[PDB]
Assembly symmetry: C2
Homo-oligomer: 101 residues x 2
């Protein structure tokens, strides 16, 4: 990953400035990469992929046929309400990482 | 190197909280290691390993014997003017490095 310092700096800004929900990394550090599992992903999806968070957008598709095809395949999901939004607070921060370049 | 964090932190403190002389690292970073060479060592030794900065100390040796064997081996070194010691100021802040969990 080190070959793209721009993305690294953007991620470092997020990690070092935000605290919590927005400071959570986006690129799966080594330990978490080692620890992740199929059941972990399955539980994450089952808990977070609920109906009030599904939007089926179409670009050049007629509405009538689109809904006629996507109603049977989606109307049977459980109606789990939206959880509380993950709150984060912005603080200062200084990140610094030496390397070869 | 990471197996002993104490030495790493001593080196880090020296580098961070000194500026030139004491800040010069002791464990030869990778770029310096690649740059280093035999002729460079030759020149460094020939420039620095001079007589006015050499002490030969014995622990269990008669002084007469030691001097009688050492004078025919060190008396002909060139007399140099002992170039001055480097300067270093203390003002320094923080070093932070992220590793294992």
């Amino acid at each position: 990953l080190s070959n793209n310092p721009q993305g690294l700096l953007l991620e470092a800004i997020h990690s070092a400035g935000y605290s919590g929900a927005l400071a959570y990394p986006l690129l799966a550090p080594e330990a978490a990469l080692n620890r992740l599992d199929g059941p972990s992903l399955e539980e994450f999806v089952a808990e977070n992929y609920t109906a009030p968070r599904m939007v089926l957008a179409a670009a050049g598709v007629e509405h009538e046929e689109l809904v006629s095809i996507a109603e049977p395949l989606l109307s049977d999901l459980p109606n789990v309400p939206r959880p509380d939004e993950p709150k984060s607070v912005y603080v200062g921060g200084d990140f610094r990482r030496h390397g070869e370049s």
